[PDB]
Amino acid sequence: AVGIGAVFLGFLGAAGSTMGAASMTLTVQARNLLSGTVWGIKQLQARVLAVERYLRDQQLLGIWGCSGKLICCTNVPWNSSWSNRNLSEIWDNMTWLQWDKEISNYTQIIYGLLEESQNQQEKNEQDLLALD
Amino acid sequence: QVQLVQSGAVIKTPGSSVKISCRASGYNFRDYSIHWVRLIPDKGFEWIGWIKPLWGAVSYARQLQGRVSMTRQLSQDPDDPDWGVAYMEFSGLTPADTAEYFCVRRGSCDYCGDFPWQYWGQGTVVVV
Amino acid sequence: NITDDMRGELKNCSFNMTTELRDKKQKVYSLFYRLDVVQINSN
Amino acid sequence: KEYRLINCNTSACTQACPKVSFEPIPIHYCAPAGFAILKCKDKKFNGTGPCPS
Amino acid sequence: IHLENVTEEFNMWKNNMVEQMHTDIISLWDQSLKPCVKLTPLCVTLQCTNVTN
Amino acid sequence: INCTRPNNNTRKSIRIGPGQAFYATGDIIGDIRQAHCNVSKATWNETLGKVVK
Numbered sequence: 001a002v003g004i005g006a007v008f009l010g011f012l013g014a015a016g017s018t019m020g021a022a023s024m025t026l027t028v029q030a031r032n033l034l035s036g037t038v039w040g041i042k043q044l045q046a047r048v049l050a051v052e053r054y055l056r057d058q059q060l061l062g063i064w065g066c067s068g069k070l071i072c073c074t075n076v077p078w079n080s081s082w083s084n085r086n087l088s089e090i091w092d093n094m095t096w097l098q099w100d101k102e103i104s105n106y107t108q109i110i111y112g113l114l115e116e117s118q119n120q121q122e123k124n125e126q127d128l129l130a131l132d
Numbered sequence: 133q134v135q136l137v138q139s140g141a142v143i144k145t146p147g148s149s150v151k152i153s154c155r156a157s158g159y160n161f162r163d164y165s166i167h168w169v170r171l172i173p174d175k176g177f178e179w180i181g182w183i184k185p186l187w188g189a190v191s192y193a194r195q196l197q198g199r200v201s202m203t204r205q206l207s208q209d210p211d212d213p214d215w216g217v218a219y220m221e222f223s224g225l226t227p228a229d230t231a232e233y234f235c236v237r238r239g240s241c242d243y244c245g246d247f248p249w250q251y252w253g254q255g256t257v258v259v260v
Numbered sequence: 261n262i263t264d265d266m267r268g269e270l271k272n273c274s275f276n277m278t279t280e281l282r283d284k285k286q287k288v289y290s291l292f293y294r295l296d297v298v299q300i301n302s303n
Numbered sequence: 304k305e306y307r308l309i310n311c312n313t314s315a316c317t318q319a320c321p322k323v324s325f326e327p328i329p330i331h332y333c334a335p336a337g338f339a340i341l342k343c344k345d346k347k348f349n350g351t352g353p354c355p356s
Numbered sequence: 357i358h359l360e361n362v363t364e365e366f367n368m369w370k371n372n373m374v375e376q377m378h379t380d381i382i383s384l385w386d387q388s389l390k391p392c393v394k395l396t397p398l399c400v401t402l403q404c405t406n407v408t409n
Numbered sequence: 410i411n412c413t414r415p416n417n418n419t420r421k422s423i424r425i426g427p428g429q430a431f432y433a434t435g436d437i438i439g440d441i442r443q444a445h446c447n448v449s450k451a452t453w454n455e456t457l458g459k460v461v462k
């Protein structure tokens with residue numbers, strides 16, 4: 001009576017789905033990530049841990065190309081030695097949980113490449129608006 | 133629960149003074165006012181007074197002043213703060229005062245007034 | 261060994277003290293320094 | 304034949320307040336923002352290893 | 357809400373939140389004894405005898 | 410600097426109440442002596458020469 005698509009649209013409802021189908025609903029996981037005599041200190045430090053981690057994530061977005069786009073095209077090529085898989089096999093085969101273990105080893109290279117790309121883009125835009 | 137337990141029915145003489153107790157239990161007794169109301173045959177209800185048990189500030193019916201008196205007794209222990217006793221010394225007894233007396237408490241809702249008397253004692257019949 | 265000119269840095273003080281039981285008490289002694297005790301005022 | 308309580312030689316004792324009770328009231332443990340609680344809906348599950356549901 | 361096609365290994369023995377609940381109920385058991393009466397004045401000589409029986 | 414106390418103290422637990430222990434001084438075992446500190450004469454006169462300089 002509730003329907004399968006209704007609990008599909010819940011929190012973490014697409015964790016077993018394909019990542020192409022899981023891409024349709026990312027705002028749900030992004031929304032239940034911020035809001036939700038001695039014990040007030042414990043709940044208070046839990047709340048500030050939540051907002052501080054959300055700010056760390058929004059800053060790591062903000063130092064890249066996108067501030068609030070939630071889907072971010074960018075300009076570093078995928079080094080195919082990182083995963084060596086076809087496109088249509090990963091967007092229709094695996095989940096996100098299965099993909100993260102495949103790319104957990106090759107990470108913090110990608111983040112530095114994104115920061116280098118954004119620094120290069122900002123200085124190129126500075127030069128372009130400088131000569132104009 | 134909210135319980136109001138009065139005393140038994142009593143027979144008095146004209147010119148005497150009756151004391152009627154009203155033990156209240158099941159709520160914080162210092163918060164809610166206690167009203168007293170009477171029921172006379174062929175006369176209906178009539179209000180007597182109220183008492184606020186926090187300090188004991190009372191207010192009497194205008195046509196019963198000089199005769200009625202209301203006191204209370206609070207519970208001073210950190211184990212049973214719930215119970216309390218109200219009293220009513222009704223004096224200057226006449227044969228017309230043969231009636232059934234009730235001690236009442238209002239409700240606990242937000243839109244409850246003071247006079248929507250929710251909880252009622254079982255009544256005490258006074259025959260003069 | 262005691263000399264009148266010299267002053268000892270320790271005193272041997274006995275006193276009543278309460279116990280686990282509120283009815284009973286005990287005579288017990290300790291050693292204190294000169295600087296922790298003062299004289300209240302033979303004995 | 305004179306007695307004393309057993310705990311006198313080790314610890315001063317505290318009476319429970321008769322106003323407060325000891326009966327169980329059910330706690331629901333809740334995850335804060337940024338976490339989640341998973342529940343094994345499986346039937347035959349010894350608490351170690353994979354839970355399929 | 358149900359979650360499909362998923363295999364999370366569980367472990368009740370190295371589980372957390374049973375450690376912190378065992379901490380929390382002890383600490384809260386202590387926090388419900390601070391307003392109560394200490395039996396310091398009751399450690400005293402008792403003169404006991406058999407009950408009438 | 411080498412500082413010492415040549416006395417050999419024995420402590421003595423004195424119960425005050427339930428769960429209350431007062432740690433007194435029992436007997437002195439050995440010679441009653443006076444505590445002191447030692448520095449070297451040469452290094453101290455050298456460092457005083459440095460601080461005058």
Ligand SMILES: *[C@@H]1O[C@H](CO)[C@@H](O[C@@H]2O[C@H](CO)[C@@H](O[C@@H]3O[C@H](CO[C@H]4O[C@H](CO)[C@@H](O)[C@H](O[C@H]5O[C@H](CO)[C@@H](O)[C@H](O)[C@@H]5O)[C@@H]4O)[C@@H](O)[C@H](O[C@H]4O[C@H](CO)[C@@H](O)[C@H](O)[C@@H]4O[C@H]4O[C@H](CO)[C@@H](O)[C@H](O)[C@@H]4O[C@H]4O[C@H](CO)[C@@H](O)[C@H](O)[C@@H]4O)[C@@H]3O)[C@H](O)[C@H]2NC(C)=O)[C@H](O)[C@H]1NC(C)=O
Nearest residue numbers: 272273274275276277278284285286287288289290302303
């Ligand atoms: C730890 O806690 C302990 C528990 O309390 C504590 O021990 C008690 O300490 C007090 C004071 O130090 C003791 O009181 C003294 O007791 C002496 C012992 O006498 C007892 O034993 C005798 C048997 O040997 C009994 O016969 C005797 O009873 C007789 O005497 C009573 C005296 O009032 C009388 O009421 C009875 O009816 C009976 O007739 C008693 O039970 C006792 O001797 C002493 O009195 C004088 O004697 C000493 C010489 O022996 C003097 O040095 C001492 O100073 C007392 O002099 C008094 O009298 C002089 C002459 O009149 C005065 O000039 C003095 O000022 C002084 O007067 C004071 O005392 C009077 C009572 O005596 C009083 O009436 C005055 O107003 C004035 O205040 C004294 O009574 C007690 O016995 C101890 N109890 C125990 C169980 O040991 C201990 O001190 C604490 N500390 C330590 C480190 O342990």
Ligand SMILES: *[C@@H]1O[C@H](CO)[C@@H](O[C@@H]2O[C@H](CO)[C@@H](O[C@@H]3O[C@H](CO[C@H]4O[C@H](CO)[C@@H](O)[C@H](O)[C@@H]4O)[C@@H](O)[C@H](O[C@H]4O[C@H](CO)[C@@H](O)[C@H](O)[C@@H]4O)[C@@H]3O)[C@H](O)[C@H]2NC(C)=O)[C@H](O)[C@H]1NC(C)=O
Nearest residue numbers: 304305306307308398400401402403404405406407408409
């Ligand atoms: C644990 O142990 C304690 C020990 O102290 C018990 O406490 C005593 O218990 C006894 C017996 O249960 C009590 O004695 C009874 O007291 C009654 C009330 O006392 C009044 O009357 C007497 C006159 O007898 C006055 O002296 C007193 O001041 C009071 O004004 C009496 O009515 C009883 O008398 C009846 O029994 C005797 C038996 O010999 C008959 O001869 C009499 O005719 C009469 O029928 C009796 O004397 C005593 O009072 C208790 N003391 C206290 C301080 O309470 C506990 O009861 C016990 N508990 C348990 C569970 O075992």
Ligand SMILES: *[C@@H]1O[C@H](CO)[C@@H](O[C@@H]2O[C@H](CO)[C@@H](O[C@@H]3O[C@H](CO)[C@@H](O)[C@H](O[C@H]4O[C@H](CO)[C@@H](O)[C@H](O)[C@@H]4O)[C@@H]3O)[C@H](O)[C@H]2NC(C)=O)[C@H](O)[C@H]1NC(C)=O
Nearest residue numbers: 008014015016017018019020021022091092093360361362
């Ligand atoms: C665990 O459960 C998930 C949830 O069901 C399950 O994922 C599903 O897999 C099937 C295939 O195995 C998916 O079906 C395909 O999905 C792709 C996604 O783009 C579609 O393009 C496909 O459409 C083609 O087929 C149609 C007819 O079948 C044609 O008409 C059409 O033109 C296309 O050619 C097809 O629908 C299904 O979408 C997913 N569902 C989700 C939510 O991901 C997964 O396989 C299960 N895994 C295990 C191990 O059990």
Ligand SMILES: *[C@@H]1O[C@H](CO)[C@@H](O[C@@H]2O[C@H](CO)[C@@H](O[C@@H]3O[C@H](CO[C@H]4O[C@H](CO)[C@@H](O)[C@H](O)[C@@H]4O)[C@@H](O)[C@H](O)[C@@H]3O)[C@H](O)[C@H]2NC(C)=O)[C@H](O)[C@H]1NC(C)=O
Nearest residue numbers: 280306307308309310311312313314422424427428429430
């Ligand atoms: C605080 O005081 C309490 C009350 O005294 C103490 O509780 C009891 O302490 C005794 C020790 O003194 C424990 O053991 C008892 O000991 C006597 C004598 O011991 C001899 O016999 C036993 C028999 O096995 C033997 O093992 C010994 O080596 C001795 O040879 C026995 O007669 C008793 O039956 C009993 O064994 C008590 O068990 C203990 N009571 C309880 C309820 O446990 C307490 O220890 C004190 N605590 C502190 C910190 O001081």
Ligand SMILES: *[C@@H]1O[C@H](CO)[C@@H](O[C@@H]2O[C@H](CO)[C@@H](O[C@@H]3O[C@H](CO)[C@@H](O)[C@H](O)[C@@H]3O)[C@H](O)[C@H]2NC(C)=O)[C@H](O)[C@H]1NC(C)=O
Nearest residue numbers: 076077078079080081082083106107108109110112113114
């Ligand atoms: C994409 O994958 C290729 C895999 O062939 C990467 O090429 C290799 O990159 C590593 C470092 O990432 C090079 O190692 C280097 O070796 C020199 C030798 O002196 C050393 O000094 C460096 O510190 C470093 O360890 C390796 O040589 C290189 N392979 C070849 C054949 O040159 C490539 O870097 C990947 N691209 C990105 C953007 O990560």
Ligand SMILES: *[C@@H]1O[C@H](CO)[C@@H](O[C@@H]2O[C@H](CO)[C@@H](O)[C@H](O)[C@H]2NC(C)=O)[C@H](O)[C@H]1NC(C)=O
Nearest residue numbers: 261262263264265266267268269270271272294
């Ligand atoms: C016991 O100690 C007392 C004091 O605690 C001594 O009395 C005096 O002690 C000081 C120095 O401690 C001396 O200067 C005084 O001369 C002492 N008084 C007298 C009258 O000599 C006392 O000497 C010590 N010894 C004895 C045996 O009582």
Ligand SMILES: *[C@@H]1O[C@H](CO)[C@@H](O[C@@H]2O[C@H](CO)[C@@H](O)[C@H](O)[C@H]2NC(C)=O)[C@H](O)[C@H]1NC(C)=O
Nearest residue numbers: 410411412413445446447448449450451452453
């Ligand atoms: C302070 O004490 C230390 C001991 O811990 C002394 O150091 C030793 O002194 C002896 C002389 O008797 C030497 O033989 C050792 O080689 C020293 N050991 C070390 C590790 O230095 C030190 O001399 C004392 N200081 C003074 C000023 O007396």
Ligand SMILES: *[C@@H]1O[C@H](CO)[C@@H](O)[C@H](O)[C@H]1NC(C)=O
Nearest residue numbers: 082100101102103104105106
């Ligand atoms: C990731 O790299 C480590 C070596 O740094 C290797 O041990 C591990 O197997 C790699 N993971 C995958 C999934 O290949």
